Design a binder for this molecule. Structure first.
Ligand SMILES: CCCCCCCCCCCCCCCCCC(=O)OC[C@H](COP(=O)([O-])OCC(O)COP(=O)([O-])OC[C@@H](COC(=O)CCCCCCCCCCCCCCCCC)OC(=O)CCCCCCCCCCCCCCCCC)OC(=O)CCCCCCCCCCCCCCCCC
Ligand SMILES: CCCCCCCCCCCCCCCCCC(=O)OC[C@H](COP(=O)([O-])OCC(O)COP(=O)([O-])OC[C@@H](COC(=O)CCCCCCCCCCCCCCCCC)OC(=O)CCCCCCCCCCCCCCCCC)OC(=O)CCCCCCCCCCCCCCCCC
Ligand SMILES: CCCCCCCCCCCCCCCCC[C@@H](O)O[C@H](CO[C@H](O)CCCCCCCCCCCCCCC)COP(=O)(O)OCC[N+](C)(C)C
Ligand SMILES: CCCCCCCCCCCCCCCCC[C@@H](O)O[C@H](CO[C@H](O)CCCCCCCCCCCCCCC)COP(=O)(O)OCC[N+](C)(C)C
Ligand SMILES: CCCCCCCCCCCCCCCCC[C@@H](O)O[C@H](CO[C@H](O)CCCCCCCCCCCCCCC)COP(=O)(O)OCC[N+](C)(C)C
Ligand SMILES: CCCCCCCC/C=C\CCCCCCCC(=O)OC[C@H](COP(=O)(O)OCCN)OC(=O)CCCCCCC/C=C\CCCCCCCC
Ligand SMILES: Nc1ncnc2c1ncn2[C@@H]1O[C@H](COP(=O)(O)OP(=O)(O)O)[C@@H](O)[C@H]1O
Lengths: 104, 347, 320, 49, 122, 56, 459, 98, 55
């Protein structure tokens, strides 16, 4: 036969615009395609995007940024008035630390 | 062959294995091995042809040599301590000979040549029996004498078995030889952890037996013994090829599949000892088995090979005989990893 | 209960049902000869089951409903275009020959299963032992290649060796010019293009290979055209045969058990017809294979197992 | 519709169906009973109630 | 090496010693039992698919039997597994209690007295 | 007529039901980790005259 | 966090029980709802992590990754339904099943509290990806691509398993909280050096580190579009997540074991950026872009500073979004002209203006135009490297120039010039493709508006 | 051990070596197998007689029984091989490879 | 030079070459019991001396 095998020919690609000039590119069935467009748009842009962005914008301050700012204001006020240094090099009281006896 | 005679021979094979497993006397264990071999020889020749005759002859010669060495080791042990009970094996030379004889019976490398040949020469049912049921007796005996075993010899043979299983399997287009090399590698894995923990040996044996049963039953369902004949199964029963693909993935050891569990537990057990280098090499080597399982999956399930015209006639008919345990075997081969802590009931 | 080792262990034995009228009969002959009428008359007189010659859609007749399917999903070959274009470059000739051999193997398995299950005789038109005459006629006329002949020989070698040959072979002899006259008188516009050399090749193949090698298994009953209309004489000629020369008398219970397990399970029967020998005439690409299989699975009674297709009126599925 | 008997007929095999359902129900009630006695025995041995 | 093969008082083929009755049985809603039932349901589905039957609807009695059998075996499997782990813990604690020299409780040191080297990241 | 509507769109309750089941199981999991409820040095508190537990 | 895991497991039978013509709709809607639910994980604390149970926990490093995974699922669904139209119903359901299983494994991987469970899930992610690539790829190179993807990964990951079980036998636990609180320094011995290498190489090959990246161009070019999306956006970030987790127990050994990987990362960053300048395949260019950005991420993780960790987190999120968008943009042209060669279809701005705008925005984010989170991450990493050593700015500086060059080269080659005369089948952009590009790009700028949500736990 | 024990063990080793190296005939290797069985019988009998283990006097009979079973098995296989090839050469058993 | 040749040459191509060569070495046996029973004899003798003589 001068052939090697029985095979279907490679078919041409279908244009969704031919049977549906406003086809939205979701499906060949116009009704299913239209509703796929609608659900994608509503649940992506209207619900997740805008409402999720609002939710994230108004999340309560569990990172304690404002609490830390107010605590630092109290500490600075107290230390400035008393004449104490604003900050201490050692964050742990040396009285609770026991260095090794001998360094030689 | 008469069905009654076939059933009698199968029960005699199983009776020999059970006699090995329940005996306390070395003579009774040797008798169990003899009975098992005597009944097993005709089962390999059930479908008579020159290849089956050659496979039976090679099997008989190998196993008879192994049993002769087994008996000699028993007699030497008796000579140096008048004990017939299966115990710590008071003599080292006798223990070495016993280890070599049991390795010959199992098909561990260096004595691994017979397994690919006997498996290719017999039918798929005989291969199923040979690669599943025939491992129980030597492994049970090895488990009972694990304390007196010399780690250097057993570990050498286990690592050689893993290496040779991978390398030999890399070169095969016949499915029975692929199964035989896979069996060799899994035997190596089983015997690598034996000196440290026999529960892991039992767990690996059970999981391997389940996966092997599933694979052989899938191969019998779709009557394929070569890679190219298995490449047609997609055009007749695609579900069979999909299940075979998942089972092949499980055999490879990829998580979250059940196949991964024995290797994981054996690696953990070996690292509970010092033993760091050996598990690393064993995993790197099991990558080869994974490679040729993946090649089989490429050929049978993930791509579609050309078919023939006469497959249309086969489309019209159904499979008459049905294997009742195949779904359970597939499920146990694939989805059992979350139940891993249940291995405690094995000890 | 399904026949198997358990049925053989207790009770069932084939050797007891054979009642001197088992006698697998095949009635061979060239094209357009009246072998079918003779076969039907023999079956009616002797009380045997008649099997009409297996065509392209023989396998369709036995599964699902007996109605034939589309040629694309069954056969994928045409007898008419074989006569129109015997030298087509699409492999129609050898594809048809291979499909017909597979159909004949299936029909032989069905007849053997019926005989071994009931003890009743069967009459066939042609057999797997006769199918090669058409292959030789095609090859000598240059309609197929030599590789196709080698593939046919491989499949026949691994398939036809597992069964028992017919007890008696009946041959109807009709000369080639008379065959041409009959074909012209018929009226079918495709059979008129059959050259006389094709019929001569079929006749040479028959008389120089089939009958000689079949006469060693069992004696052959040959008949000229005029002595084939008298069916009662042929039947009474059959009743006085001494059949103790072939493999049939040397069959005991266990061999019959093996053969009976083989004749059922038609997948086992057809196993070796689809061997992975890649001839362009019969090799089908993956895309076309997938498309045709998807087409087949959409037939009204084909998606599931027989008793499980609710779209053809299967009830109580959820308890089966 | 079918050319041959197709032995599984339109009605299901009632013997097999009944045996299957009976086995399932027997196993379920046995498991419930066993769990109840196990709970009672555990509570008795450790003296909870 | 076999850790529990020869523990005194062990009955050869019991699968469930009388001592195990002193442990709380697994709840019938144990997630492990539910996973075993899921395994049985998967086996039933695969059985339907292999036999070319409607996968979800073909045999409800068969699927029920599959799920029930897997749950039934899993219950006793879980009981035995829990018993083995309880045995292991019991033996561990008894051995530690009976060999005080090998398990000393040394003096506790606070982090204010332990000198740890500091490795800068720069 | 709701028979066909239900048989065509009953697959739309699986995911919300899974969500509520996951919420329930998370509450159940939280119920098993109360060994230090109202016991930390930082949050130890005297109970109100009516309440029973500080958190659920 | 079963309130997220269980709905995906319910996506599975919802897909397998749907009508033949509603699978895409149902999967998309419920995937988007699951993403909305996962959005609640962004409420993180300042001191410790959210410890849901003994098994699952959520940190400030894994919450954006989970959100990215759940958001990527619907986009893959929209991108896949075009070229799968001729497929049978069962195979379409199997494709969706593969995607759902991949999402489930990824979701469980980012929240596992133990390292062995994390390993099991991070390795289970292999099977769906390999099946997708080798079954639904287009060309015959997909088989080799699958083999390369599998073995490169496993050869790195198995020593990690050995090291993990060894560590558990040594310290008694693999729980991440216990590991962090009970951390002890690593001495300078050959055993410790090889333990470091075993704990690091799997994540290195996942990034992938330069010289160990050859699998990535093959796998990312030969895969279908959804495969490429999930391979570039999420699966590469497994290496970075695992490396930031595991480096807790590797100090102070890292102080000098990081040198070869740092040199490889910087020089191979330069090399892969240069490779992008001469590339005839449009998808391979995007793959090598991914390699360069991940080399930057490797450097940031290796130098071990708070600023470098913040930059690494931001860069991983930004790169996921940008690379997924670029792959989708290339797939549109491939579906139009059935060829990947970059100079075949030219002057496309004349024929498709809105798609040209999408191309411009994607290539602007690729070159890290401020104040995009791409640039935030890149600049944090550059500052951290400058503090590490002042000479890194030269290598970093060269990379910035090269990245701009090849990004705009891609843009000008594909969009500008004159349209090829012989190609007349360039249909207008569908609504689906435009919605896909918009859903890729809008979250990027929205995250720019509030950048502390992607800056990690070191913030 | 005495000299007789070493001699019997040497006989066993020689028969094993004989079995391991095949010449042409299969029957010669079967004879070597029987020789190993005989050597084991002699060794076990000597050990049991020396230690006066009365109940162990019956084991060598069992050994002989199973030796006979093994020899019958080997002879049957030889009959089949010879019927296939008209010769009992081990060179003909080369249809299956590794 | 680097990505398409040498990086390919060292890690994956070397591994493939070595595995293929060892597969050819291991799997190509004639199936003659004489040769590998001689192999068995060598293994047995080595085993007694190498691992058995050292206890
Ligand atoms: C981790 C979390 C949990 C996950 C658990 C693990 C995963 C899920 C469980 C796995 C096992 C379960 C299913 C087993 C049977 C499936 C076999 C099968 O063929 O299915 C076809 C069958 C369709 O057949 P049909 O409907 O009769 O008619 C169509 C024809 O049959 C048309 O059929 P056909 O034969 O003509 O079509 C040919 C097709 C047929 O080939 C197949 O169908 C392949 C199926 C192979 C089964 C998987 C192997 C064994 C399981 C191992 C899974 C490993 C998972 C771990 C990760 C590794 C990934 C592999 O073959 C191909 O097309 C070749 C494609 C090549 C792709 C290769 C990939 C295959 C492996 C993928 C496995 C992924 C997991 C399962 C996917 C789902 C399968 C349904 O599918 C189904 O309809 C059943 C699925 C749905 C059942 C569950 C629904 C439950 C009820 C709903 C309510 C839920 C309750 C909620 C409670 C709360 C109250 C509201
Ligand atoms: C900075 C101005 C502030 C304005 C205040 C309000 C801004 C509202 C914008 C909202 C976000 C834009 C939406 C993005 C998608 C594009 C829409 C589209 O598809 O076009 C169809 C739409 C329909 O018209 P058409 O006739 O169909 O044309 C279609 C053809 O393809 C022909 O189309 P075409 O030829 O007209 O080109 C489309 C256009 C649109 O294409 C784009 O590239 C726009 C996207 C921006 C670049 C994205 C990557 C760069 C990274 C920067 C990240 C900044 C985002 C900040 C957070 C925003 C949150 C949403 O591209 C351009 O015209 C040039 C692009 C180069 C921009 C260079 C500016 C660099 C940064 C400058 C400062 C940014 C930070 C502000 C604060 C700084 C400190 C005070 O086209 C338009 O209506 C024109 C687009 C509007 C141009 C916006 C450019 C400036 C806005 C930058 C970000 C907004 C900052 C807001 C904070 C207040 C300050
Ligand atoms: C087509 C035509 C285009 C041009 C025409 C457009 C017309 C103008 C519209 C453009 C708007 C201009 C932007 C200017 C900024 C104003 C908004 C800003 O003020 O809000 C920010 C808030 O923005 C949000 O916080 C950021 C949005 C969150 C982004 C998350 C994306 C949603 C999920 C989607 C999928 C996720 C994928 C990525 C995975 C990680 C402020 O943050 P914050 O300083 O606090 O507020 C202080 C007061 N609070 C705290 C009480 C609220
Ligand atoms: C791949 C999945 C593996 C599945 C393997 C088969 C599962 C189904 C087989 C059903 C087992 C039936 C046996 C139970 C009936 C009573 C017999 C009982 O008395 O046997 C006891 C023994 O109990 C059995 O071993 C328990 C069998 C349970 C095996 C399942 C564990 C698999 C590991 C975890 C994987 C998850 C499995 C999920 C199953 C669906 C006797 O103990 P003992 O005589 O003193 O031990 C002898 C061996 N020693 C001394 C050397 C230790
Ligand atoms: C293609 C991309 C692949 C990925 C790249 C992976 C990178 C791996 C590189 C490993 C980094 C360092 C490994 C070991 C640390 C130091 C290396 C050594 O050269 O340093 C000196 C080591 O001295 C000498 O070099 C001895 C090592 C010589 C033998 C090593 C072989 C190197 C040859 C190159 C082979 C290529 C390796 C990669 C294969 C692809 C330090 O002196 P010393 O203080 O004494 O040793 C420190 C350890 N102590 C403290 C326990 C003693
Ligand atoms: C000590 C033992 C260590 C064992 C390490 C093994 C690594 C695992 C990979 C095994 C690959 C085996 C491939 C092989 O041997 O065959 C060469 C093969 C021949 O093709 P076939 O499919 O067999 O033939 C089909 C047509 N006739 O050639 C190829 O093209 C192979 C293509 C895929 C190779 C991919 C390998 C990628 C490896 C990445 C690096 C890691 C390798 C493993 C070791 C890592 C270093 C510690
Ligand atoms: N195996 C075959 N190969 C090719 N053609 C065949 C074959 N069998 C039957 N035919 C064709 O079928 C037609 C009639 O078949 P035949 O049985 O000979 O006539 P009738 O219908 O009278 O029995 C003829 O054209 C014959 O060539």
């Amino acid at each position: 036969p001068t052939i090697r095998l029985q095979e279907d020919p490679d078919p041409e690609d279908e244009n969704l615009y031919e049977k549906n000039p406003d086809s939205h590119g979701y499906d060949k069935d116009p009704i299913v395609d239209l509703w796929n467009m609608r659900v994608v748009f509503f649940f992506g842009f209207s619900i997740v995007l805008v409402l999720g962005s609002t939710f994230v914008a108004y999340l309560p301050d569990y990172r304690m940024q404002e609490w830390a700012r107010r605590e630092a204001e109290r500490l600075v006020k107290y230390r400035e008035a008393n004449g104490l240094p604003l900050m201490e090099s050692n964050c742990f009281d040396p009285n609770k630390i026991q260095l090794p006896e001998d360094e030689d | 062959m008469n069905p009654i005679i076939y059933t009698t021979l199968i029960m005699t094979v199983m009776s020999g294995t059970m006699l090995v497993m329940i005996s306390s006397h070395w003579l009774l264990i040797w008798i169990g091995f003899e009975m098992n071999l005597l009944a097993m020889i005709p089962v390999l020749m059930k479908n008579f042809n020159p290849r089956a005759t050659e496979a039976a002859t090679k099997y008989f010669l190998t196993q008879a040599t192994a049993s002769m060495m087994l008996m000699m080791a028993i007699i030497i042990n008796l000579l140096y301590s008048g004990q017939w009970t299966i115990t710590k094996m008071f003599n080292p030379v006798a223990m070495t000979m016993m280890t070599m004889a049991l390795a010959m019976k199992l098909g561990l490398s260096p004595f691994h040549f017979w397994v690919p040949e006997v498996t290719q020469g017999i039918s798929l049912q005989a291969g199923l029996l040979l690669l599943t049921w025939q491992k129980l007796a030597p492994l049970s005996v090895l488990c009972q004498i694990s304390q007196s075993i010399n780690p250097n010899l057993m570990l050498t043979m286990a690592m050689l078995s893993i290496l040779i299983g991978g390398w030999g399997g890399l070169n095969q287009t016949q499915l029975r030889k692929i199964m035989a090399y896979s069996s060799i590698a899994h035997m190596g894995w089983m015997t690598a952890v034996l000196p440290y923990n026999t529960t892991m040996t039992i767990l690996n044996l059970l999981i391997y037996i389940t996966m092997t049963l599933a694979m052989f039953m899938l191969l019998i369902h779709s009557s394929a013994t070569t890679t190219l004949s298995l490449s047609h199964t997609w055009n007749k029963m695609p579900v069979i090829t999909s299940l075979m693909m998942v089972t092949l993935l499980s055999m490879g050891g990829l998580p979250p599949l059940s196949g991964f569990m024995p290797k994981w537990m054996i690696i953990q057990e070996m690292t509970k000892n010092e033993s760091i280098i050996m598990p690393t090499l064993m995993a790197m080597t099991a990558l080869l088995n994974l490679y040729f399982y993946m090649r089989l999956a490429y050929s049978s399930s993930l791509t579609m090979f050309p078919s023939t015209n006469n497959m249309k006639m086969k489309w019209q008919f159904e499979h008459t005989k049905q294997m009742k345990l195949l779904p359970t075997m597939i499920v146990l081969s694939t989805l059992v990893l979350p139940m891993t802590p249940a291995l405690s009931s094995l000890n | 209960l399904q026949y198997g080792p358990l049925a053989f262990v207790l009770g069932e034995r084939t050797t007891r049902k054979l009642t001197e009228t088992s006698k697998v009969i095949t009635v061979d002959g060239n094209i357009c000869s009246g072998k079918g009428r003779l076969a039907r008359e023999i079956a009616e007189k002797l009380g045997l089951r008649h099997f009409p010659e297996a065509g392209i859609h023989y396998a369709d007749s036995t599964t699902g409903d007996g109605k034939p399917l589309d040629v694309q999903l069954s056969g994928n070959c045409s007898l008419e275009k074989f006569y129109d274009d015997p030298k087509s470059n699409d492999g129609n000739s050898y594809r048809l020959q291979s499909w017909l051999y597979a159909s004949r193997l299936l029909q032989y398995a069905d007849a053997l299963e019926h005989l071994l299950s009931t003890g009743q005789g069967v009459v066939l038109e042609r057999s797997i032992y006769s199918d090669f005459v058409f292959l030789e006629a095609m090859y000598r006329q240059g309609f197929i290649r030599k590789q196709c002949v080698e593939h046919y020989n491989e499949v026949k070698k691994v398939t036809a060796c597992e069964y028992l040959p017919p007890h008696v072979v009946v041959y109807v002899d009709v000369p080639v010019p008379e065959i041409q006259s009959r074909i012209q008188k018929k009226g079918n516009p495709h059979e008129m293009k059959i050259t006389a050399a094709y019929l001569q090749d079929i006749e040479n193949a028959y008389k120089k290979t089939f009958l000689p090698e079949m006469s060693e298994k069992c004696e052959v009953l040959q008949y000229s055209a005029r002595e084939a209309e008298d069916a009662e004489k042929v039947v009474e000629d059959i009743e006085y045969l001494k059949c103790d020369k072939g493999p049939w008398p040397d069959q005991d219970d266990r061999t019959f058990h093996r053969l009976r397990m083989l004749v059922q399970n038609k997948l086992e029967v057809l196993n070796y017809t689809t061997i992975p020998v890649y001839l362009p005439e019969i090799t089908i690409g993956a895309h076309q294979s997938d498309r045709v299989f998807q087409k087949f699975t959409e037939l009204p009674g084909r998606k599931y197992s027989p008793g499980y297709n609710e779209d053809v009126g299967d009830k109580w599925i959820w308890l089966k | 519709k079918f050319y041959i008997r197709e032995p599984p007929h339109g009605s299901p095999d009632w013997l097999k169906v009944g045996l299957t359902l009976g086995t399932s129900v027997f196993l379920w009630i046995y498991l419930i009973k066993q769990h109840k006695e196990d709970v009672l025995e555990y509570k008795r041995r450790n003296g909870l109630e | 090496m076999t850790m529990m093969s020869g523990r005194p008082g062990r009955v050869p083929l019991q699968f469930l010693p009388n001592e195990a009755r002193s442990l709380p049985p697994p709840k019938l809603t144990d997630p492990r039992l539910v996973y075993m039932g899921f395994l049985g349901y998967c086996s039933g589905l695969i059985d339907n698919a292999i036999r070319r039957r409607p996968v979800v609807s073909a045999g409800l009695h068969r699927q029920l039997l599959y799920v029930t059998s897997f749950v039934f075996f899993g219950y006793y499997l879980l009981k035995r597994q829990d018993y083995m782990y309880a045995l292991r813990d019991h033996d561990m604690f008894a051995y530690v209690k009976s060999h005080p020299e090998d398990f000393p409780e040394k003096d506790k040191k606070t982090y204010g007295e332990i000198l740890e080297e500091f490795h800068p990241v720069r | 007529n709701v028979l066909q509507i239900v048989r065509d769109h009953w697959v739309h309750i699986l995911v919300p039901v899974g969500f509520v089941f996951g919420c329930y199981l998370d509450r159940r999991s939280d119920e098993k980790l109360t060994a230090f409820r109202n016991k930390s040095l930082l949050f130890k508190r005297e109970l109100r005259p009516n309440e029973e537990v500080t958190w659920k | 966090m079963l309130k997220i895991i269980i709905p995906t497991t319910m996506l599975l039978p919802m897909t397998w029980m749907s009508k033949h013509n509603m699978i895409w709709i149902n999967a998309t809607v419920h995937s988007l709802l699951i993403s909305l639910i996962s959005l609640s994980l962004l409420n993180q604390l300042g001191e410790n992590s959210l410890n849901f149970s003994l098994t699952f926990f959520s940190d400030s490093l894994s919450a954006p990754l989970l959100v990215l995974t759940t958001w990527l699922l619907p986009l893959m669904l929209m991108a896949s339904q075009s070229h799968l139209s001729k497929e049978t119903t069962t195979r379409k359901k199997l494709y969706i099943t593969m995607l759902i299983l991949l999402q489930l494994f990824l979701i469980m991987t980012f929240t596992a509290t133990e390292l062995i469970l994390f390993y099991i899930l991070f390795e289970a992610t292999l099977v769906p990806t390999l099946i997708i690539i080798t079954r639904w790829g287009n060309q015959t190179e997909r088989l080799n691509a699958g083999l390369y993807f599998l073995f490169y990964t496993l050869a790195g990951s198995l020593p990690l398993l050995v090291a993990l079980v060894y560590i558990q036998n040594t310290t008694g636990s693999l729980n991440f909280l216990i590991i962090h609180y009970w951390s002890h320094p690593l001495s300078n011995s050959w055993s410790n050096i090889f333990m470091w290498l075993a704990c690091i190489m799997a994540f290195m090959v996942k990034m992938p580190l330069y010289g160990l990246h050859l699998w990535l161009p093959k796998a990312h070019v030969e895969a279908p579009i959804a495969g490429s999306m999930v391979l570039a956006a999420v699966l590469l970030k497994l290496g970075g997540y695992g490396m930031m987790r595991i480096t807790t127990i590797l100090n102070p050994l890292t102080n000098y074991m990081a040198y070869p990987f740092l040199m490889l990362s910087m020089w191979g960053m330069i090399m892969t950026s240069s490779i992008c300048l001469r590339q005839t395949d449009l998808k391979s260019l995007i793959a090598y872009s991914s390699v360069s950005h991940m080399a930057l991420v490797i450097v940031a993780i290796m130098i071990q500073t708070p600023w470098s960790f913040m930059g690494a987190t931001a860069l991983m999120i930004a790169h996921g979004l940008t690379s997924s968008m670029l792959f989708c943009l290339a797939n549109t042209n491939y579906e139009r002209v059935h060829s990947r060669t970059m100079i075949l279809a030219r002057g496309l701005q004349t024929l498709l203006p809105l798609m040209a705008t999408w191309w411009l925005v994607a290539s602007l984010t690729n070159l890290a135009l401020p104040p995009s989170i791409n640039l935030i991450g890149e600049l944090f990493i550059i500052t951290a490297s400058f503090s590490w050593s002042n000479i890194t700015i030269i290598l970093m500086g060269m990379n910035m120039m090269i990245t701009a060059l090849y990004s705009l080269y891609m843009l000008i080659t594909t969009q500008r010039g004159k349209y090829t005369h012989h190609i007349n089948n360039i249909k207008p952009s569908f609504t689906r493709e435009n919605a896909l590009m918009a859903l890729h790009i809008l979250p990027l700028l929205l995250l720019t508006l509030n950048p502390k949500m992607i800056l990690g736990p070191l913030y | 051990m005495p000299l007789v024990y070493m001699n019997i063990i040497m006989a066993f080793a020689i028969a094993l070596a004989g079995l391991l190296m095949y010449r042409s005939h299969l029957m010669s290797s079967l004879l070597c197998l029987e020789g190993m069985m005989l050597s084991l019988f002699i060794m076990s009998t000597l050990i049991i007689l020396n230690t006066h283990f009365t109940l162990a006097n019956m084991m060598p009979i069992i050994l002989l029984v199973f030796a006979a079973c093994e020899a019958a098995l080997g002879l049957s296989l030889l009959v089949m091989v010879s019927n296939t090839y008209g010769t009992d050469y081990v060179q003909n058993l080369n249809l299956l490879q590794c | 030079l680097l990505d398409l040749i040498w990086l390919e040459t060292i890690l994956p191509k070397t591994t493939s070459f070595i595995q293929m060569k060892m597969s050819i070495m291991v799997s190509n046996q004639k199936g003659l019991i004489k040769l590998y029973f001689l192999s068995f004899l060598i293994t047995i003798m080595i085993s007694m001396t190498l691992f058995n003589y050292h206890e």
